[model samples]
Target chain A: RPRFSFSIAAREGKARTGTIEMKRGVIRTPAFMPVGTAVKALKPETVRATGADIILGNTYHLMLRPGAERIAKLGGLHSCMGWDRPILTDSGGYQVMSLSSKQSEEGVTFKSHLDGSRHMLSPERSIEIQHLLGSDIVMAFDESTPYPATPSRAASSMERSMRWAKRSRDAFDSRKEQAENAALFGIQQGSVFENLRQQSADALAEIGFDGYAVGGLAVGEGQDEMFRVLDFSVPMLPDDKPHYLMGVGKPDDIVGAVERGIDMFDSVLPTRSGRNGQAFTWDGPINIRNARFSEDLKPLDSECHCAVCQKWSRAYIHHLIRAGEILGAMLMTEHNIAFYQQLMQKIRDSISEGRFSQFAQDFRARYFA
Target chain B: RPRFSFSIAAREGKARTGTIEMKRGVIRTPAFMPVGTAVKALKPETVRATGADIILGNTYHLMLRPGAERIAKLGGLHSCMGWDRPILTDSGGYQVMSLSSKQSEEGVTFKSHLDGSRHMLSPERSIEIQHLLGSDIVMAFDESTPYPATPSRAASSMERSMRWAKRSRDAFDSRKEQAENAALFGIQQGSVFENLRQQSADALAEIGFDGYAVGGLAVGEGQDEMFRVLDFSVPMLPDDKPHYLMGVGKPDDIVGAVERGIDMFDSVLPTRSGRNGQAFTWDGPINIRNARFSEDLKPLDSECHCAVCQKWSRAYIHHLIRAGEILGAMLMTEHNIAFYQQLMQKIRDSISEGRFSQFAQDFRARYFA
Candidate 1:
């Protein structure tokens, strides 16, 4: 069996559709990985059925709660979660910074947001945790520089992450069996500086990971600023490797990033939005809790063919939301996840047929209007 | 197709196995209807697949949140909830009594628990609401007598309920199409007094109903007293009619009630307990949040082959529960519902096999001790 491989099957200019294969399973790219950091309000099977080839787990939360060793004893995450498909795990760098506290040159030791118990996530420890949890795509631990930082501070943060990326690569390679069983992905973090991003990408390429992610965006940086950073930073990375845009956002933003040559994405936007009475459609996301929807006997998305859309009316979901029902979140989130996966499929299809640009244009026309 | 008909297939002493066929579907006795009053945490299809022939919806909550008229215009409760099978709707009598209110000889008018809006649920209005919501089995509206009542107070309450039952029947039958399309069940409420219970039963039987219910028990009355009430009260109702034990309880209680000739039951216990991290098994319900489960890789129930048990470990579910995730509630409740349905199936099978007495004895031995 192949340990890891990536092959571009089709392309429309910078946008491309491809496949990333590992020992566990194949992930179609540009793929959308639904974050399992929150309520799988969906069963893993339902998430897969929503057209996701892979989903995400957080090294931070998993380590803190169930603990990685416990998951190992339970036959790994896939076995416990009942998901047989590929699973990508984060390095816990971002959650550690945003959720609680502290960073040092060696690693960040943060207080647990859940219990205030202390925890550590060094580059090596993050890789090992991912290994213990049987991650298929293991992410490198790196410093997530705060948004609105000084240019020099961004550079300093980028330098530390690049060093951590190298150490992460070394730790992953040292574990021969884990390395053979999974793929490692290093993240590039340089805030909005073109030179720092170039430097970060070069350091990561030198370290040589299975995939590379353009990180340090979507914190609070507006879409235009993020797109500007992507335009400059993306071409600096190796085009042969899969370019992932970490935490890159709403449907329109995803489309924009895909066109900028990003091949993978993950976000809490879809399901989190759904949990709050939002439903994404070709015509944009609607707040299904609106008074107007109380009697509208229409699916959350008229164009969506997901099981939720096929079965539930917006009125009923509105009723559920108004009544404070979890099924309301369950149904709404499933639809949103479905819509996202559909967007990815459409993105892949459009690129394959060489009409991605036109699709983007038409999509924005209705979505933004 | 037949509108409503019940035929006993087999019998073991007073314990009987039968099928209650309605226009929507057939319910195998002793049936357990999962309440839809909360988050249907399990989808209706999953609930149906759990072997439940029918489900329950509340007329009170529906009329307030989505409003019964809203559900009617949107197609009906079945359409709104994506359930195609039989739905037995309560008359809003109990919810009105428990959540908020004022009661009178003519009816009960209560403030909404969700919105504090004033609303009425008279016997006639209750039947009309259920009809609009497209109930397959409608329960008559009645005053839910409080426990610890004096015998005189019990008599007064029982007499008021008998009057309400007749009014409920009159309104249901007056809507010619609704009556033919749906079965209406009369409730017997006597607050633990055998004489009052007999009077309530005799009045309901004379007025006529598609089925009969022993209500007003399980209202904090201990199992011994409820069974004593059932011992005398159940025999007073006609044996030919389906006997439902309203809001009746735990697994042991269900088996005990089944032994006393009750044919149907409903409760929020299984799922509600699950929501709080409890799991039902042949042994008993276990709290998954206990530290003991944090490392136990075994399924919630080794003997049960429900999807949750088949896929997840006690440790993982424990982690979810401890982490306060809704999916934990979803999985636990699903397993519990499956266990309840399995219990019902076992009861039916035992009765068919002429071993219900032994089955009841064996079930309580494990469930209680």
Candidate 2:
């Protein structure tokens, strides 16, 4: 396999600043990857200009709509999407769970969202799609442990995921590029249960992987509870490999998670909230569709240095959102991505300067209050 | 009145290249400003990043929906629309006639397109909105002479427009900042009749204005027919003032008009066609929505150096257009603007080198054929 290295540059308690070096490019840890789902944010160049090193792609959706094989046949995901940098493909496992009534341990049988055509996704198929996409980091296929599960059900889910992780790793090993250009990660799946979590992590460590990720925690876990789970779960996995916290969070959630040793993250919250007309700022969230913003000439955030905040005012953007103009969604999404990137940069900087605790405290106080 | 200067840099046959310098900024002659009717395209920065020196704002719809006073009170149209660059505002006369059923030489009174409230738009109100917008370039209020009209009706309309032009100039002169920061252009409204054209130009020149625009020709008068009128009418206007062609279109149309000494233009073709999945390329126009583009791995244009054409494939953009993703519109619009800007730059270069005729002949052979 191609060598991917992560070196810690500075540490402050649980926070550490590091750089992730891969064949394609280097990603500064505590890095945030913008979700380019349907490619609606800014242009890829603008996305790159916002200081993002990489972007995340949805394997399940792309496979069902455009198909990974189709993208690969064209020139792989990077060329297909007009992005030349690194791309991380999440295993279709989360999407399968989202479409779960038709999924099973054998595989997932679901109706395609595009055409309602029936389809199947298994550990083998997930690995195949990731390979076809030429993804740099491949996430292992594992069922997401359902939220608020009973302890027994959670434990069962974790074991099933552990089994699937082995299958995923085996399936990945079967691919030509999988063992060369790509790195596969084992997902630690347990529903906020310490023992099941330890069991899942231990099984995956035994199975082996290029990296490890803590999954199924951010499903709906409150911030405090999720952090508690991460404190124990992170250390259970091998320390040498990169540790990713999947589908996590607001700015505060990211900082808190990074303090617990999470190296990477991908989430739709910023993008989703942005599309819903919610603008996330360092101080707070503002709704652009609200009437109160009708005549208020202040920028989205007085402190934001983004082009959106620099050029447009809340009053105008509010009018845009209410009027159903595409500019509002575009601006809000751009700001959201920039906000996330800025937060990540701050987290990394604070860790390096041994001021992470102070930064986190100030951030949490402002965000939560 | 603020001093606005336009200089002819090169001349080949009738085609010319120049620069238009105003208080706001300097715009290259033969520049194409994108139309932002309801929404400004995607992000203002994206538009600017595509190398736009200016963009056009609609006075009619903006006044009808958001109201010009509201925008002025909040902050002018630049802050309202999130575009900090130079913005030119139309007189709102065209929308009052074209968008609503209301019409007459006396004035246009119509119910709002958004609300059912009654409103009246005369030359005074048109100039008021432009003044409220604090536009860099304000067009004189005039009727868009519908084509296939009798010489007598055309004469009457042109006369009425001259009267409105006086009203527009008088109102514009009354406002201190409007007269100081803003420049006014008189619209010449003669049908294809040379005598009517001479009369309109004579009245506008006698009144004396910052700029002069030859209007009412592109309506349905074929290119040869319009050029015949342009041939007679262009030299009749004062050589010292800038001459604009209002609502004039197409790559070829712009090329031909610029040859007649028209200095500036604004059209929805590039932006409107973008939303409809059409992209203007150097060779010809491309409809990206067409199925023939499917699986074509080539960029939108092979010769152009636009970021969109450099990175994205025709097939992927085709997919985006098919999926009705807004990114398709965003990228397509950005590419179209870049294409237009590139055209302007090339035209300017050819004019400077005094090879404009040879350049036009080559462009015509490829673009038309």
Candidate 3:
């Protein structure tokens, strides 16, 4: 009896409606976790108001600005961020791979994007930082297998990630009290090759984890390649536990992944695109700053029931965006988060009602139309 | 039979607690109106939540960006901005004088600061623009007399403003129906000279207006000089009519102005400074970016009951400000606005209790200590 556990309430066509029980609260799934990149984007309560049961934080950004040790002294991430619910912290692996200051057999050392300060992120250090931040679900540090890598390169990356996964698991287990309260999630990384993905997933399953994540798919690999990997990769992990799809995706991608059995997801799309003045509507994504919206008195999305859409007009949002107002970003971000959560709710409802297949078909036709 | 009227409810020394009756709603005075310079700073409901009964909008910015005609077509400023309360719109005169492209007797023609588009603002045009925007309280157009002007130069400028005030009244009178619904307030401008200020006030009173504003005082004239000018300028206006101190600032200045019989005040200080990481607390203003606040777990202001203060800590705000997050601005702005409104409430309470002098003394020692 660990403090964290997951149970599926219902399922349809490989899709799930479940809940992750953490000491702090229960997180309902299929869930979409909003990315809280900084403490200031949207308050944790605001995120909660968006129907998010949990949120994701980046180890790379948090460690650099407010050091992980500093956060622990300030009562960890939960108190510092004023978010008492569950939080999942990603390993700094992806950022280090993309930033690429230096990578070696032991760890990845990188310069801070903000000030060029030096830092190192190894598997043990990653687990240690997440523990310090009091993460409920901690991701194992694994090398991100770059898309277009050769089969040999993919295999080598997968094997190294397996080794790091064991190290991550060992680090978490070292703190017996922390291990009892929190759950370690293993990340499976393989470039698009089926055998490589299977090997990677098998390695992670053998290492064992409270949960597993299908990673290295959304890293610029097109949807077809991603789905192909998921088709072979997802089933290799344990069925009873949660399956997370890291850094995914558009609405269609989420629907497709849910169809393939991913119970959780994290992405910056909704909030990021919102700040950039793009809104995700039921019909399609529309740019708020478009000249056509200048005098449009209608809401940003007619189908949206979020406070922004209910209170603010497209014309008002248009004017704010044009003037580079912070409120524009706030309103749009809130609306987008609400939209993403609503989409997840619909998916969960459809799955519980055994209508996921038809729902997916209709969603794809309209979303990608 | 005007749609707007003011009545004093209680008095203590020179301070009075009163309410302004407008078609939209009642505005309690001495009220502090938050400046909604752009559409995105804070939403109307959020502003209302901070206890704002009225809000100030800039005629210059509105005219340049959305265009008065476009706003009217979109059902006027109240509907356009989603704010249903009374709105006070400043004449474009100050901005034109400050951000001048060109100026002459008939009008001031200027390039929009946002774009290079040319626009002209005259007394008649300013009234017409405010009318089109459906401002509940429209300010008469008058030149912002510059600081350090010679007495002769001040006299000439005051005379021109008087003539403009007369023209503005004429323009409003021409629209008999609009004038009855939206009260017009004339601006008294004569730099810092007492005789000139009195003469300007006398000219405005002779022309007659629904209200009189003591202007050209907060334009870099120190608080002492501003109060000195108000000492002579405020009494010159009709005692029964509302007395507005145009753009009068800071908490202490506001307290002093209220004691001098000024009924209303508006400034971007709280909201603007909040965005810049400044928090106005009962103790005094503190910058959130200060290193001392990095790990201070106490609320931003222990006395503050704002949602931001009640939920967020100084350390959290510090992290957001240092990280340059939008929520940082939103939180700080919210707290400051709440602080201002609460201060006004306290002032009104003190006046009604006949303890204003004691309250003012205690406030100054604490705030400026």
Best prediction by TM-score = 1
lDDT of 3 at A352: 88
DockQ of each: 0.78, 0.52, 0.64
For model 2, residues A290-351, the per-residue Cα lDDT tens digits are: 88888888888888778888888888878777777777778888888888888888888888
Docking quality tier of model 2:
medium
> A13-67 in candidate 3: lDDT tens per residue?
6788988898888989999999987323577777899899999988988898688
lDDT of 3 by residue, B1-369 (tens): 339888999987677898889998999988999997742456787899999999999998899878999999989999988899999999988887776466677878888776688888899999999999999999999877778799998998899999999999999999986777899999888887888888888899899998988888788879888888888788888888889988868999999999998989998889888878899988899999999998889998989988888888898889888888888888899999999999999999999899999999999999988
Q: How do the residues A90-109 of candidate 1 rate in per-residue lDDT, one tens digit apiece?
A: 98888888777557889988
Instruction: Give the C-alpha miss distance for residue B92 in model 3, angstroms.
Output: 1.1
lDDT score at residue A300, model 1, on the 0-100 scale:
91
lDDT of the structure predicted as candidate 3 = 0.87
Two-chain complex of model 2, DockQ on C-alpha atoms against the true structure: 0.52
Instruction: Report the TM-score measured on chain A for model 3.
Output: 0.97
* Second chain alone, TM-score for each candidate: 0.98, 0.95, 0.97
